Amino acid sequence: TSTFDRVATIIAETCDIPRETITPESHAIDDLGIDSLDFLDIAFAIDKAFGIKLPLEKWTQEVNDGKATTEQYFVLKNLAARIDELVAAKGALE
Amino acid sequence: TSTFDRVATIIAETCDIPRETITPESHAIDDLGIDSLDFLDIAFAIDKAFGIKLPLEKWTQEVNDGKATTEQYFVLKNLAARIDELVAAKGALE
């Protein structure tokens, strides 16, 4: 099962959002009716689901230091790529 | 300077929000025109400002486990109380 599909499922069940409406181009923020509280629930679910920790503070720092754009963290297809990166690192550690 | 006042200043300057409109009863979320991206900037600024880390994942877990309400984390007066608690702990460690 692809990382994105796993993410879509998590989001759909975490915020009761119709799975069919979630695409790789959707956003984990300001979209799908996802409010701030909803997003924190998504980040929580993703962390436990993949055994990782979305480093929100670190990401915010990069977007401010001009080292990243919001799209690379919140666009679902890219969020999946961020998760794969965090998984690879956590895997090595394990 | 009170913890709340410090928080109000941070929020005002982080999201360019008129300080006069920030009260102890305001919310760090779904209020003051604060969107999800704005909130993450606020959490970031608070962490560095007080030398602490707002444990967002842990809080989300408590609100889900029925061990806490959103009000005790996002209502500014209460957020200030959460910060004072995190500071006390960090202080002891230091």
PDB file of C-alpha atoms in Angstrom:
ATOM      1  CA  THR A   1       0.000   0.000   0.000  1.00  0.00           C
ATOM      2  CA  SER A   2       1.445   3.387  -0.998  1.00  0.00           C
ATOM      3  CA  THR A   3       2.379   5.928   1.653  1.00  0.00           C
ATOM      4  CA  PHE A   4      -0.096   8.421   0.206  1.00  0.00           C
ATOM      5  CA  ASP A   5      -2.966   5.907   0.318  1.00  0.00           C
ATOM      6  CA  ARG A   6      -2.118   5.183   3.941  1.00  0.00           C
ATOM      7  CA  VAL A   7      -2.159   8.914   4.640  1.00  0.00           C
ATOM      8  CA  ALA A   8      -5.513   9.376   2.876  1.00  0.00           C
ATOM      9  CA  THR A   9      -7.045   6.565   4.931  1.00  0.00           C
ATOM     10  CA  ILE A  10      -5.745   8.054   8.173  1.00  0.00           C
ATOM     11  CA  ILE A  11      -7.090  11.485   7.330  1.00  0.00           C
ATOM     12  CA  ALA A  12     -10.456  10.113   6.182  1.00  0.00           C
ATOM     13  CA  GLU A  13     -10.998   8.169   9.402  1.00  0.00           C
ATOM     14  CA  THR A  14      -9.445  10.746  11.733  1.00  0.00           C
ATOM     15  CA  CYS A  15     -11.631  13.637  10.573  1.00  0.00           C
ATOM     16  CA  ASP A  16     -14.528  11.673   9.074  1.00  0.00           C
ATOM     17  CA  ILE A  17     -13.753  12.971   5.595  1.00  0.00           C
ATOM     18  CA  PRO A  18     -14.942  11.021   2.522  1.00  0.00           C
ATOM     19  CA  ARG A  19     -11.894   9.115   1.260  1.00  0.00           C
ATOM     20  CA  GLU A  20     -12.933   9.628  -2.375  1.00  0.00           C
ATOM     21  CA  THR A  21     -12.399  13.366  -1.948  1.00  0.00           C
ATOM     22  CA  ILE A  22      -8.772  13.017  -0.826  1.00  0.00           C
ATOM     23  CA  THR A  23      -6.161  13.294  -3.580  1.00  0.00           C
ATOM     24  CA  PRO A  24      -2.357  13.570  -3.797  1.00  0.00           C
ATOM     25  CA  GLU A  25      -2.925  17.249  -4.627  1.00  0.00           C
ATOM     26  CA  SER A  26      -5.120  17.883  -1.565  1.00  0.00           C
ATOM     27  CA  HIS A  27      -3.701  19.795   1.426  1.00  0.00           C
ATOM     28  CA  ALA A  28      -3.463  18.589   5.035  1.00  0.00           C
ATOM     29  CA  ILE A  29      -4.138  22.221   5.899  1.00  0.00           C
ATOM     30  CA  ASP A  30      -6.707  24.800   4.723  1.00  0.00           C
ATOM     31  CA  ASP A  31      -8.545  22.208   2.676  1.00  0.00           C
ATOM     32  CA  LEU A  32     -10.999  19.326   2.947  1.00  0.00           C
ATOM     33  CA  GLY A  33     -12.634  21.326   5.733  1.00  0.00           C
ATOM     34  CA  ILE A  34      -9.601  20.611   7.904  1.00  0.00           C
ATOM     35  CA  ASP A  35      -9.280  23.174  10.679  1.00  0.00           C
ATOM     36  CA  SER A  36      -6.354  23.647  13.055  1.00  0.00           C
ATOM     37  CA  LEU A  37      -7.619  21.141  15.633  1.00  0.00           C
ATOM     38  CA  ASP A  38      -8.226  18.624  12.834  1.00  0.00           C
ATOM     39  CA  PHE A  39      -4.668  18.998  11.543  1.00  0.00           C
ATOM     40  CA  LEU A  40      -3.175  18.338  14.960  1.00  0.00           C
ATOM     41  CA  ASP A  41      -5.254  15.145  15.080  1.00  0.00           C
ATOM     42  CA  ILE A  42      -3.875  14.178  11.672  1.00  0.00           C
ATOM     43  CA  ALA A  43      -0.261  14.812  12.698  1.00  0.00           C
ATOM     44  CA  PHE A  44      -0.915  12.738  15.837  1.00  0.00           C
ATOM     45  CA  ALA A  45      -2.446   9.854  13.877  1.00  0.00           C
ATOM     46  CA  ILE A  46       0.389   9.888  11.316  1.00  0.00           C
ATOM     47  CA  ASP A  47       3.063   9.782  14.037  1.00  0.00           C
ATOM     48  CA  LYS A  48       1.593   6.676  15.658  1.00  0.00           C
ATOM     49  CA  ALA A  49       0.653   5.096  12.318  1.00  0.00           C
ATOM     50  CA  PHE A  50       4.201   5.277  10.934  1.00  0.00           C
ATOM     51  CA  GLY A  51       6.138   5.187  14.195  1.00  0.00           C
ATOM     52  CA  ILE A  52       7.634   8.615  13.533  1.00  0.00           C
ATOM     53  CA  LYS A  53       7.262  12.192  14.690  1.00  0.00           C
ATOM     54  CA  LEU A  54       6.396  15.018  12.294  1.00  0.00           C
ATOM     55  CA  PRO A  55       8.885  17.673  13.452  1.00  0.00           C
ATOM     56  CA  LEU A  56       6.490  20.628  13.160  1.00  0.00           C
ATOM     57  CA  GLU A  57       8.803  23.076  14.929  1.00  0.00           C
ATOM     58  CA  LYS A  58      11.696  22.187  12.630  1.00  0.00           C
ATOM     59  CA  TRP A  59       9.540  22.538   9.508  1.00  0.00           C
ATOM     60  CA  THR A  60       8.252  25.954  10.606  1.00  0.00           C
ATOM     61  CA  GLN A  61      11.883  27.023  11.014  1.00  0.00           C
ATOM     62  CA  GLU A  62      12.760  25.984   7.447  1.00  0.00           C
ATOM     63  CA  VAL A  63       9.762  27.739   5.922  1.00  0.00           C
ATOM     64  CA  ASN A  64      10.869  30.877   7.780  1.00  0.00           C
ATOM     65  CA  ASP A  65      14.564  30.522   6.925  1.00  0.00           C
ATOM     66  CA  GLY A  66      13.594  30.185   3.272  1.00  0.00           C
ATOM     67  CA  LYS A  67      14.860  26.588   3.252  1.00  0.00           C
ATOM     68  CA  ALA A  68      11.432  25.189   2.354  1.00  0.00           C
ATOM     69  CA  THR A  69       7.935  26.018   1.103  1.00  0.00           C
ATOM     70  CA  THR A  70       4.662  25.087   2.771  1.00  0.00           C
ATOM     71  CA  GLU A  71       3.791  22.940  -0.233  1.00  0.00           C
ATOM     72  CA  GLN A  72       6.541  20.455   0.562  1.00  0.00           C
ATOM     73  CA  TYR A  73       4.980  19.730   3.962  1.00  0.00           C
ATOM     74  CA  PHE A  74       1.199  20.179   3.537  1.00  0.00           C
ATOM     75  CA  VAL A  75       0.477  18.990  -0.034  1.00  0.00           C
ATOM     76  CA  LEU A  76      -0.467  15.345   0.546  1.00  0.00           C
ATOM     77  CA  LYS A  77       1.796  13.924  -2.160  1.00  0.00           C
ATOM     78  CA  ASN A  78       4.724  15.789  -0.609  1.00  0.00           C
ATOM     79  CA  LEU A  79       3.704  15.011   2.951  1.00  0.00           C
ATOM     80  CA  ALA A  80       3.964  11.351   1.876  1.00  0.00           C
ATOM     81  CA  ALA A  81       7.496  12.031   0.663  1.00  0.00           C
ATOM     82  CA  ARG A  82       8.326  13.672   4.037  1.00  0.00           C
ATOM     83  CA  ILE A  83       6.967  10.617   5.853  1.00  0.00           C
ATOM     84  CA  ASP A  84       9.059   8.256   3.709  1.00  0.00           C
ATOM     85  CA  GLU A  85      12.135  10.312   4.679  1.00  0.00           C
ATOM     86  CA  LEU A  86      11.294  10.186   8.395  1.00  0.00           C
ATOM     87  CA  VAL A  87      10.622   6.441   8.152  1.00  0.00           C
ATOM     88  CA  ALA A  88      13.970   5.746   6.482  1.00  0.00           C
ATOM     89  CA  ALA A  89      15.742   7.590   9.295  1.00  0.00           C
ATOM     90  CA  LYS A  90      13.736   5.908  12.069  1.00  0.00           C
ATOM     91  CA  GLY A  91      14.284   2.545  10.414  1.00  0.00           C
ATOM     92  CA  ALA A  92      18.061   2.917  10.480  1.00  0.00           C
ATOM     93  CA  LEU A  93      17.885   3.884  14.140  1.00  0.00           C
ATOM     94  CA  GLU A  94      15.869   0.727  14.855  1.00  0.00           C
TER      95      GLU A  94
ATOM     96  CA  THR B   1       5.903  41.281  32.797  1.00  0.00           C
ATOM     97  CA  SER B   2       3.111  38.692  33.033  1.00  0.00           C
ATOM     98  CA  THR B   3       3.288  35.493  31.010  1.00  0.00           C
ATOM     99  CA  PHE B   4       0.052  36.383  29.227  1.00  0.00           C
ATOM    100  CA  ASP B   5       1.346  39.831  28.223  1.00  0.00           C
ATOM    101  CA  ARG B   6       4.479  38.197  26.853  1.00  0.00           C
ATOM    102  CA  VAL B   7       2.299  35.781  24.897  1.00  0.00           C
ATOM    103  CA  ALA B   8       0.116  38.599  23.529  1.00  0.00           C
ATOM    104  CA  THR B   9       3.199  40.492  22.352  1.00  0.00           C
ATOM    105  CA  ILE B  10       4.594  37.406  20.634  1.00  0.00           C
ATOM    106  CA  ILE B  11       1.326  36.708  18.868  1.00  0.00           C
ATOM    107  CA  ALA B  12       0.858  40.350  17.848  1.00  0.00           C
ATOM    108  CA  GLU B  13       4.310  40.571  16.274  1.00  0.00           C
ATOM    109  CA  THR B  14       4.367  37.040  14.853  1.00  0.00           C
ATOM    110  CA  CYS B  15       1.100  37.379  12.929  1.00  0.00           C
ATOM    111  CA  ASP B  16       0.908  41.173  12.680  1.00  0.00           C
ATOM    112  CA  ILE B  17      -2.215  41.266  14.831  1.00  0.00           C
ATOM    113  CA  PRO B  18      -3.148  44.473  16.705  1.00  0.00           C
ATOM    114  CA  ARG B  19      -2.050  43.923  20.311  1.00  0.00           C
ATOM    115  CA  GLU B  20      -5.080  45.820  21.645  1.00  0.00           C
ATOM    116  CA  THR B  21      -7.336  43.102  20.243  1.00  0.00           C
ATOM    117  CA  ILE B  22      -5.614  40.282  22.147  1.00  0.00           C
ATOM    118  CA  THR B  23      -7.161  39.375  25.503  1.00  0.00           C
ATOM    119  CA  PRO B  24      -6.754  36.604  28.102  1.00  0.00           C
ATOM    120  CA  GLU B  25     -10.036  35.206  26.753  1.00  0.00           C
ATOM    121  CA  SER B  26      -8.845  35.167  23.124  1.00  0.00           C
ATOM    122  CA  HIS B  27      -7.896  31.853  21.473  1.00  0.00           C
ATOM    123  CA  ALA B  28      -4.551  30.936  19.890  1.00  0.00           C
ATOM    124  CA  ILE B  29      -6.674  28.962  17.444  1.00  0.00           C
ATOM    125  CA  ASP B  30      -9.805  29.759  15.396  1.00  0.00           C
ATOM    126  CA  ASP B  31      -9.716  33.387  16.454  1.00  0.00           C
ATOM    127  CA  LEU B  32      -7.972  36.689  15.781  1.00  0.00           C
ATOM    128  CA  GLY B  33      -7.826  35.571  12.153  1.00  0.00           C
ATOM    129  CA  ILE B  34      -5.252  32.965  13.154  1.00  0.00           C
ATOM    130  CA  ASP B  35      -5.126  30.138  10.631  1.00  0.00           C
ATOM    131  CA  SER B  36      -3.276  26.836  10.956  1.00  0.00           C
ATOM    132  CA  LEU B  37      -0.003  28.152   9.514  1.00  0.00           C
ATOM    133  CA  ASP B  38      -0.234  31.165  11.840  1.00  0.00           C
ATOM    134  CA  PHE B  39      -0.672  28.943  14.895  1.00  0.00           C
ATOM    135  CA  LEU B  40       2.404  26.897  14.062  1.00  0.00           C
ATOM    136  CA  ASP B  41       4.339  30.174  13.861  1.00  0.00           C
ATOM    137  CA  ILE B  42       2.989  31.125  17.285  1.00  0.00           C
ATOM    138  CA  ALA B  43       3.947  27.783  18.845  1.00  0.00           C
ATOM    139  CA  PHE B  44       7.413  28.190  17.297  1.00  0.00           C
ATOM    140  CA  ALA B  45       7.830  31.735  18.627  1.00  0.00           C
ATOM    141  CA  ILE B  46       6.630  30.732  22.112  1.00  0.00           C
ATOM    142  CA  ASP B  47       9.074  27.806  22.287  1.00  0.00           C
ATOM    143  CA  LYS B  48      12.084  30.000  21.537  1.00  0.00           C
ATOM    144  CA  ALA B  49      10.759  32.922  23.594  1.00  0.00           C
ATOM    145  CA  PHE B  50      10.392  30.857  26.778  1.00  0.00           C
ATOM    146  CA  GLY B  51      13.045  28.228  26.113  1.00  0.00           C
ATOM    147  CA  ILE B  52      10.461  25.445  26.161  1.00  0.00           C
ATOM    148  CA  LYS B  53       8.635  23.169  23.760  1.00  0.00           C
ATOM    149  CA  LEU B  54       4.838  23.106  23.519  1.00  0.00           C
ATOM    150  CA  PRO B  55       4.230  19.337  23.425  1.00  0.00           C
ATOM    151  CA  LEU B  56       1.466  19.438  20.798  1.00  0.00           C
ATOM    152  CA  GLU B  57       1.383  15.668  20.291  1.00  0.00           C
ATOM    153  CA  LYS B  58       1.027  15.055  24.025  1.00  0.00           C
ATOM    154  CA  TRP B  59      -1.760  17.631  24.351  1.00  0.00           C
ATOM    155  CA  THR B  60      -3.693  16.124  21.431  1.00  0.00           C
ATOM    156  CA  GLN B  61      -3.459  12.765  23.209  1.00  0.00           C
ATOM    157  CA  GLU B  62      -4.965  14.176  26.420  1.00  0.00           C
ATOM    158  CA  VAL B  63      -7.832  15.896  24.627  1.00  0.00           C
ATOM    159  CA  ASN B  64      -8.581  12.546  22.972  1.00  0.00           C
ATOM    160  CA  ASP B  65      -8.181  10.475  26.144  1.00  0.00           C
ATOM    161  CA  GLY B  66     -10.607  12.823  27.877  1.00  0.00           C
ATOM    162  CA  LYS B  67      -7.820  14.020  30.189  1.00  0.00           C
ATOM    163  CA  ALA B  68      -8.111  17.622  28.983  1.00  0.00           C
ATOM    164  CA  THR B  69     -10.235  20.122  27.055  1.00  0.00           C
ATOM    165  CA  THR B  70      -9.090  22.314  24.182  1.00  0.00           C
ATOM    166  CA  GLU B  71      -9.773  25.382  26.307  1.00  0.00           C
ATOM    167  CA  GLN B  72      -6.931  24.554  28.675  1.00  0.00           C
ATOM    168  CA  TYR B  73      -4.423  24.718  25.811  1.00  0.00           C
ATOM    169  CA  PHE B  74      -5.774  27.309  23.333  1.00  0.00           C
ATOM    170  CA  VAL B  75      -7.491  29.942  25.525  1.00  0.00           C
ATOM    171  CA  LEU B  76      -4.699  32.493  25.990  1.00  0.00           C
ATOM    172  CA  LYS B  77      -5.078  32.798  29.761  1.00  0.00           C
ATOM    173  CA  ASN B  78      -4.774  29.018  30.039  1.00  0.00           C
ATOM    174  CA  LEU B  79      -2.013  28.766  27.464  1.00  0.00           C
ATOM    175  CA  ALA B  80      -0.095  31.134  29.771  1.00  0.00           C
ATOM    176  CA  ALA B  81      -0.702  28.722  32.638  1.00  0.00           C
ATOM    177  CA  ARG B  82       0.583  25.828  30.460  1.00  0.00           C
ATOM    178  CA  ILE B  83       3.710  27.836  29.644  1.00  0.00           C
ATOM    179  CA  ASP B  84       4.345  28.582  33.331  1.00  0.00           C
ATOM    180  CA  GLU B  85       4.150  24.820  33.990  1.00  0.00           C
ATOM    181  CA  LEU B  86       6.590  23.999  31.178  1.00  0.00           C
ATOM    182  CA  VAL B  87       8.948  26.745  32.376  1.00  0.00           C
ATOM    183  CA  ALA B  88       8.970  25.444  35.951  1.00  0.00           C
ATOM    184  CA  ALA B  89       9.916  21.990  34.676  1.00  0.00           C
ATOM    185  CA  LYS B  90      12.591  23.275  32.281  1.00  0.00           C
ATOM    186  CA  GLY B  91      13.963  25.500  35.021  1.00  0.00           C
ATOM    187  CA  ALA B  92      14.489  22.580  37.389  1.00  0.00           C
ATOM    188  CA  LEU B  93      16.246  20.676  34.623  1.00  0.00           C
ATOM    189  CA  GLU B  94      18.572  23.650  34.084  1.00  0.00           C
TER     190      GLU B  94
END
